[PDB]
Design a protein around this motif. Structure first.
Motif, short mmCIF file in Angstrom:
data_model
loop_
_atom_site.label_atom_id
_atom_site.label_comp_id
_atom_site.label_asym_id
_atom_site.label_seq_id
_atom_site.Cartn_x
_atom_site.Cartn_y
_atom_site.Cartn_z
N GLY A 41 -6.77 96.98 -89.24
CA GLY A 41 -5.29 97.13 -89.66
C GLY A 41 -4.62 98.43 -89.12
N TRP A 42 -3.23 98.57 -89.77
CA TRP A 42 -2.52 99.89 -88.97
C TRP A 42 -2.89 101.14 -89.16
CZ3 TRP A 42 3.18 98.35 -91.28
CH2 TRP A 42 3.88 97.36 -90.69
N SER A 43 -3.81 101.43 -90.36
CA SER A 43 -3.91 102.62 -90.60
C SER A 43 -5.60 102.96 -90.15
CB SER A 43 -3.72 102.95 -92.22
OG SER A 43 -4.54 102.11 -92.92
N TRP A 50 1.89 87.92 -94.76
CA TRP A 50 1.56 89.18 -95.14
C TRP A 50 2.64 89.39 -96.49
CZ3 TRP A 50 -1.83 93.10 -93.95
CH2 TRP A 50 -1.64 94.33 -94.86
N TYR A 86 8.00 90.10 -97.54
CA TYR A 86 8.86 91.11 -97.80
C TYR A 86 9.93 91.38 -96.92
CZ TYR A 86 6.17 92.81 -93.65
OH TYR A 86 5.69 92.70 -92.51
N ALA A 111 -8.05 92.77 -97.06
CA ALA A 111 -7.66 93.81 -96.20
C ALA A 111 -7.64 95.12 -96.77
CB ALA A 111 -6.13 93.46 -95.89
N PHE A 112 -8.41 96.15 -96.20
CA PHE A 112 -9.21 96.14 -95.11
C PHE A 112 -10.72 96.81 -95.47
CE2 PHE A 112 -4.64 96.21 -93.75
CZ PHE A 112 -4.77 95.20 -92.68
N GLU A 172 -5.12 97.30 -84.24
CA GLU A 172 -3.52 97.22 -84.11
C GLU A 172 -3.13 98.61 -83.55
OE1 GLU A 172 -1.49 95.08 -86.95
OE2 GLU A 172 -3.30 94.11 -87.57
N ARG A 206 12.80 93.93 -94.63
CA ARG A 206 13.04 95.29 -93.89
C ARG A 206 14.63 95.48 -93.87
NH1 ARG A 206 8.92 98.22 -91.81
NH2 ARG A 206 7.24 96.82 -92.04
N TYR A 234 6.00 89.33 -87.44
CA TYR A 234 6.87 89.96 -88.43
C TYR A 234 6.91 91.51 -88.00
CZ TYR A 234 2.06 89.61 -90.28
OH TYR A 234 0.72 89.25 -90.83
N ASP A 235 7.84 92.26 -88.79
CA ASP A 235 8.11 93.67 -88.33
C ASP A 235 8.73 93.72 -86.93
OD1 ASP A 235 6.66 94.51 -90.83
OD2 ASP A 235 4.74 94.03 -89.76
N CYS A 249 -12.17 101.39 -97.61
CA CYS A 249 -11.09 102.01 -98.26
C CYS A 249 -10.84 102.75 -99.54
CB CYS A 249 -9.78 101.24 -98.11
SG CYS A 249 -8.32 102.12 -98.62
N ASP A 300 -6.49 95.22 -100.76
CA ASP A 300 -7.23 95.67 -101.81
C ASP A 300 -6.52 96.59 -102.84
OD1 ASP A 300 -6.96 98.15 -100.37
OD2 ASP A 300 -8.93 99.05 -100.80
N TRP A 301 -5.24 96.88 -102.48
CA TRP A 301 -4.15 97.66 -103.29
C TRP A 301 -3.61 96.99 -104.08
CZ3 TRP A 301 -3.64 97.07 -98.39
CH2 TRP A 301 -2.46 96.78 -97.85
N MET A 355 1.19 88.49 -85.33
CA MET A 355 1.87 89.27 -86.16
C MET A 355 3.26 89.08 -85.79
SD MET A 355 -0.65 90.57 -88.14
CE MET A 355 -0.29 92.10 -88.72
N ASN A 387 1.95 107.41 -94.46
CA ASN A 387 0.63 107.15 -95.02
C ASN A 387 -0.22 108.13 -94.76
OD1 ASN A 387 -1.62 105.68 -95.88
ND2 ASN A 387 -1.59 104.00 -94.98
C1 DW0 Z 1 3.83 95.21 -93.93
N1 DW0 Z 1 2.48 94.83 -93.07
C2 DW0 Z 1 2.53 93.63 -92.10
N2 DW0 Z 1 1.06 93.98 -91.34
C3 DW0 Z 1 0.55 95.08 -91.82
C4 DW0 Z 1 1.54 95.67 -92.92
C5 DW0 Z 1 1.02 96.85 -93.40
O1 DW0 Z 1 1.85 97.44 -94.26
N3 DW0 Z 1 -0.03 97.27 -93.05
C6 DW0 Z 1 -0.55 98.72 -93.48
C7 DW0 Z 1 -1.31 98.87 -94.75
C8 DW0 Z 1 -1.62 100.15 -95.25
N4 DW0 Z 1 -2.46 100.26 -96.21
C9 DW0 Z 1 -1.84 100.83 -97.56
O2 DW0 Z 1 -0.84 100.97 -97.32
C10 DW0 Z 1 -2.88 101.04 -98.50
C11 DW0 Z 1 -4.14 100.50 -98.53
N5 DW0 Z 1 -4.83 100.90 -99.35
C12 DW0 Z 1 -3.99 101.29 -100.41
N6 DW0 Z 1 -2.75 101.54 -99.96
C13 DW0 Z 1 -1.31 101.88 -100.38
N7 DW0 Z 1 -4.73 100.18 -97.35
C14 DW0 Z 1 -6.20 99.42 -97.31
C15 DW0 Z 1 -3.80 99.93 -96.11
O3 DW0 Z 1 -4.39 99.36 -95.14
C16 DW0 Z 1 -0.98 96.61 -92.10
O4 DW0 Z 1 -1.94 97.39 -91.69
N8 DW0 Z 1 -0.63 95.55 -91.33
C17 DW0 Z 1 -1.57 94.91 -90.85
#
Ligand code: DW0
Ligand code: DW0
Ligand code: CO
Length: 573
Positions: A95-97, A396, A277, A36-37, A136, A279, A222-223, A49, A10-11, A220, A149
């Motif tokens: 997602g990760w966050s 991604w 992307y 996402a997401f 995750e 690394r 990657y990374d 988000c 979404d960003w 996934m 983050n």
């Molecule tokens: C490289 N990559 C590969 N798989 C990934 C990523 C990744 O960066 N993120 C982490 C991404 C966190 N994020 C942001 O950074 C983020 C955001 N809104 C604004 N920003 C700035 N959101 C909604 C978000 O989830 C993931 O969650 N996954 C699965």
């Protein structure tokens, strides 16, 4: 059979990604598009988000005012599907966050059940086609990394019950999806994001139960190498280079796929990952690990600092290193930024590892090293997918792809599609919508003098807003607003020559007279509970409605997007 899946954050729409709106996604090259997401709290309620991005931004569409209910990414995804019916649109949760609340939600059946109910309502109102669960990861204790983050939840409540509870949640999701698909006459899918490494799989992923439930699973891959290690490596390699040291063993597409298969994963359900992307590391010395691949698996010196001053071997990123906003030096540049990367890190030479089928960039004097996917390696991954009867590729992320000859970001997406599918058009699917509760009345108005006649018409939006919480009430509101209404009137021997305020203008299109409320600022978003009452002019006076055959209405998200949900709201007997 095959899938070409893409993440869209979404960003993407903000300056940090170059203001990339969904209308510039190459949707005719994708089978699945993941939003996402969406977030969600410990009570199973959905949480945006960024509300504006999801429901309000105009996204470059002429005639959408910021905040108009037809704005936002979720509505733009519907338009992409209408313009590109090869496409299925879907929502990624977590997602990760934003995986911090899966543990608590999955542990308790009543909360699992509320979460599922809220997700079902969400994809109903957004007309989405699939749910993607990106937990995750289950079973993996992880603290927030607020330097990377500020918004990272981590997974601090992770436990060993996650593995089993995840299956229950997937079962509950797939059952609800099954049930709502039959109610709406549509086919839903359930997918998940899975880790590449054995160690996380053992802790959180009951492979054979999971693949029995889901429609497909996105690995996934990657990374898999990065600034967390002091050894250079491939982050997204198709094959494990034989010279790889212990930490990178198993950390390739081929090896991860073979592990999942060995645990019972069905091949057609496995989707492999491509990174759009880099690394990378600031200063890698060639330890001669593979003289054919200089600098690969070499030692990276711990010479840079994260934005919290933590020492790190990571190279600088495309984006400035800000505490809480990309605070870790990870050598992360978007693929569309490879020329920016070369201008900042000069002297990089491009190498192809033919054992890994992976490219990398390396300056043998300074040590700088970057790992990534290019066209060639995406083609090799597609070759592998085809040859092992796998399920497709996932990327991604959309905003990091490069443009080619238009404003669409599509270089790697077009490479992936064409290597998986050839040059032919992707298969198209029927798109269904739920008819809105729209009624109407038509009354002759007796004309005693003058030329012509008049029909007084009323159209009422009888939808009613029910939902609670920010997420469900905003997407309900959008679904229950009648958007850019066109009124199709078929007559028998009578011309509709004009309309009066507050109607939109009248036109004749084939056998129908057409009233276009999208052309009226006041007419184009008709809210739940609103009635439009207006006069139509006729070339002859009428005393009844026997000369009217039928009245239909259709909608459009934007004045220039396709009409959808044509439905009959009045018929003569
Ligand atoms: C490289 N990559 C590969 N798989 C990934 C990523 C990744 O960066 N993120 C982490 C991404 C966190 N994020 C942001 O950074 C983020 C955001 N809104 C604004 N920003 C700035 N959101 C909604 C978000 O989830 C993931 O969650 N996954 C699965
Ligand atoms: C210390 N370490 C040792 N081996 C590791 C890691 C590590 O952090 N990551 C993780 C690299 C991708 N990634 C992140 O970057 C990440 C994240 N959550 C937040 N961030 C910011 N997750 C869930 C994740 O998978 C790994 O992939 N491996 C193999
Ligand atoms: Co199995």
């Amino acid at each position: 059979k095959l899938r070409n899946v893409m993440y869209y954050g979404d960003w993407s729409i903000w300056g940090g990604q170059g203001n990339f709106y969904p209308k510039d996604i190459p949707a005719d090259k994708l089978t699945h598009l993941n939003f996402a997401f969406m977030d969600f709290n410990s009570s199973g309620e959905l949480i945006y988000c960024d509300k504006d991005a999801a429901i309000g931004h105009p996204l470059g569409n002429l005639g959408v005012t910021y905040g108009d209910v037809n704005g936002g990414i979720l509505n733009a995804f519907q338009v992409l599907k209408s313009e590109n019916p090869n496409l299925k649109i879907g929502v990624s949760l977590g997602g990760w966050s934003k995986s911090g609340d899966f543990s608590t939600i999955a542990a308790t059946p009543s909360i699992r059940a509320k979460f599922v109910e809220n997700v079902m309502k969400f994809i109903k109102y957004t007309n989405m086609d699939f749910v993607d669960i990106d937990w995750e990861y289950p079973g993996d204790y992880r603290e927030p990394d607020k330097t990377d983050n500020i918004n990272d939840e981590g997974t601090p409540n992770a436990s060993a019950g996650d593995k089993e509870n995840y299956i229950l949640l997937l079962q509950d999701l797939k059952e609800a999806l099954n049930k709502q698909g039959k109610e709406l006459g549509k086919v839903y899918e359930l997918s998940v994001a899975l880790p590449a490494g054995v160690s996380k799989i053992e802790k959180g992923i009951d492979v054979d139960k999971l693949f029995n439930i889901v429609d497909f699973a996105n690995i996934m891959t990657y990374d898999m190498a990065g600034a967390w290690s002091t050894t250079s490596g491939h982050q997204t390699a198709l094959y494990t280079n034989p010279n790889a040291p212990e930490e990178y063993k198993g950390l390739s597409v081929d090896e991860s796929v073979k592990y999942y298969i060995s645990q019972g994963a069905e091949r057609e359900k496995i989707v492999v990952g491509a990174a759009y992307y880099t690394r990378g590391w600031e200063q890698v010395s060639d330890k001669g690990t593979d003289p054919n691949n200089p600098g690969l698996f070499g030692e990276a010196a711990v010479v840079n600092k994260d934005a919290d001053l933590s020492p790190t071997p990571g190279a600088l990123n495309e984006a400035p290193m800000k505490n809480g906003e990309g605070g870790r030096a990870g050598g992360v540049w978007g693929y569309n930024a490879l020329d920016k990367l070369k201008s900042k890190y000069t002297g990089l030479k491009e190498y192809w590892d033919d054992s890994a089928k992976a490219p990398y960039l390396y300056n043998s004097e300074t040590g700088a090293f970057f790992t990534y996917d290019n066209i060639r390696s995406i083609q090799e991954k597609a070759k592998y997918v085809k040859e092992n009867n796998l399920g497709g590729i996932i990327g991604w992320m959309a905003s990091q792809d490069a443009t080619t000859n238009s404003t669409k970001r599509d270089e790697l997406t077009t490479a992936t599609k064409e290597s998986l599918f050839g040059k032919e058009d992707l298969p198209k699917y029927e798109i269904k919508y739920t008819e809105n509760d729209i009624t109407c009345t038509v009354t002759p108005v007796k004309q005693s003098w003058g030329s012509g006649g008049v029909l007084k018409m009323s159209i009422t939006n009888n939808e009613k807003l029910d939902e609670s919480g920010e997420v469900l009430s905003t997407v309900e509101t959008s679904a229950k607003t009648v958007k850019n209404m066109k009124v199709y009137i078929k007559t028998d021997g009578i011309a509709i020559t004009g309309s009066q305020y507050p109607a939109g203008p009248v036109t004749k299109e084939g056998d129908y007279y057409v009233i276009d409320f999208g052309k009226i600022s006041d007419g184009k978003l008709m809210k739940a509970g609103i009635t439009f009452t207006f006069d139509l002019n006729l070339d002859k006076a009428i005393e009844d409605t026997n000369n009217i055959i039928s009245i239909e209405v259709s909608q459009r998200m934007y004045q220039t997007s396709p009409e959808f949900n044509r439905q009959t709201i009045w018929e003569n007997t």
